[PDB]
Amino acid sequence: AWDEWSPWSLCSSTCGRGFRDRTRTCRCEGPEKQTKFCNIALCP
């Protein structure tokens, strides 16, 4: 009843803590989003 999750997004921050998200749609109530922590670099 679900499409595949999208790829995880880039980190919302280019340094320091941020969020990454992905989403899936029905193809089943409605769309779903998953969110996680990310940190790709220390800020200067």
Ligand X SMILES: *[C@H]1O[C@H](CO)[C@@H](O)[C@H](O)[C@@H]1O
Ligand Y SMILES: *[C@@H]1O[C@@H](C)[C@@H](O)[C@@H](O[C@@H]2O[C@H](CO)[C@@H](O)[C@H](O)[C@H]2O)[C@@H]1O
Contact 31, 22 (CB under 8 A): no
Q: Which does 4 bind (CB under 5 to 8 A by kind): ligand Y, ligand X, none?
A: ligand X
Q: What is the DSSP string of the chain?
A: -BPPPPPPPPPS-SSSSEEEEEEE-B---S-EEEEEEE--S---
> Taking CB under 6 A as the rule, does residue 39 contact ligand Y?
no
- Which residue, 3 or 15, has its beta carbon nearer to ligand X? 3
> Taking CB under 6 A as the rule, does residue 15 contact ligand Y?
yes
CB of 42 to ligand X, least distance (A): 20
